[PDB]
Design a protein around this ligand. Sequence first.
Ligand SMILES: Nc1nc2c(ncn2[C@@H]2O[C@H](COP(=O)(O)OP(=O)(O)OP(=O)(O)O)[C@@H](O)[C@H]2O)c(=O)[nH]1
Lengths: 169, 243
Amino acid sequence: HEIGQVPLLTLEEEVELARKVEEGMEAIKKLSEITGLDPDLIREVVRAKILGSARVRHIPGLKETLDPKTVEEIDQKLKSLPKEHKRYLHIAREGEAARQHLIEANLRLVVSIAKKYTGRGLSFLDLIQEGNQGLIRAVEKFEYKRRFKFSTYATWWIRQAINRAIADQ
Amino acid sequence: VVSRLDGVALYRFPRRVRVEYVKKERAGLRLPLAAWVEKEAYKPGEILAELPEPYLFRAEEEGVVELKELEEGAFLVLRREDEPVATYFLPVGMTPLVVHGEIVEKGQPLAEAKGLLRMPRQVRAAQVEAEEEGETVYLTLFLEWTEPKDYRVQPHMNVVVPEGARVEAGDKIVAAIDPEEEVIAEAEGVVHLHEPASILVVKARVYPFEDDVEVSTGDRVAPGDVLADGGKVKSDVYGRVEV
DNA sequence: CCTGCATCAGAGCCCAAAA
DNA sequence: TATAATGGGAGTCTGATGCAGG
RNA sequence: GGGG
Ligand SMILES: Nc1nc2c(ncn2[C@@H]2O[C@H](COP(=O)(O)OP(=O)(O)OP(=O)(O)O)[C@@H](O)[C@H]2O)c(=O)[nH]1
């Protein structure tokens, strides 16, 4: 019932979200150069403001405990940028927002792949969650320029994730 | 399609981008004198002259005809070799008697003018200079008008320009996967968005900004929080920021 | 206020008990 | 790592107590 | 399934 509350994407909508995610990744790379920060640290800080205060925790690999003090300090250095530099902050924020929607709109794909993998020692929902893990991998690696529909690329990463799950757990 | 809620309507994916290009040109006309109403300028639609009987507007140069037809009204352009020798303006009520690429000689009728002739709806008259010779007046008209051109947007293309934007020569309107198929602005013009894929009705407030904006997208905001332009524009409703 | 009505937690001991 | 693929399959009888309902 |  919860997946059925996110409508499926139009070819246009699919390309639009995919486009914004790629541009945002490029924006974060550039924001690293300008600022002297870490591309991952910036990405987690950018991502923190989109999802909200709900999720705040230390992230394995990040140099800073990622508590409200550090995200305010670092966000204020990013919002203190000149107009031509600060345009990249707006890009990163919108990139993360579109990523969330892209993932959510493709959840039904994972179900249709996982249902075929039942009976191998993982419960249906365990297969869905591992399948969702691959979908996240697929959204980050997708290159929209190749003109392929998203469903084609995702399926490889989702199939890969379920099969690794069954073999490991 | 009928909307179910109050809010801001938003265009999703315009299939057709129409650019109205701005043209300012000096073109001539000759009319009787006992028939033209004297004004120093003409608003669109304004009556230029009224003829008792049909008058034949005649060529004042020899050349080949380049005919450019507007929605209503016409332009006629004579050139010998490729050098343009004349630019004539035919208002509404004046029917061209020549066809594109036709040879004409000095003195042959280009257009018939019958009754009341007025400015077309899309074209203006800024400065109007006149000369009087015999029983006719020759108007040197400084005309301004917009010529529409349509561009098609494909699913892999996104429009990078807002409704009503100002573009000079070279500006990008639509972007695409590969360098070809891009839409580059041919010359100065204004942009209009048409045929959207769907209309997204959002319950939201719109706060335009000229200078740099201090809140980035995703921030949450309460009435009174400063948005952009150093404190000039601020938020009314409780809500979520979209830049 | 009172009564249907469900959801839950009970239902003997010891021995072989041949999987 | 790239045609596209987008919402699942399946099983008695007793007494005590805390609950939405004429 | 079997013993008291
Ligand atoms: N609790 C219990 N007792 C059992 C069970 N099976 C056998 N018995 C014993 O079987 C005994 C039956 O003994 P009977 O031979 O019928 O004793 P009786 O009253 O003298 O009857 P008669 O010998 O015919 O005169 C009882 O003493 C039980 O303890 C059982 O499954 N459960």
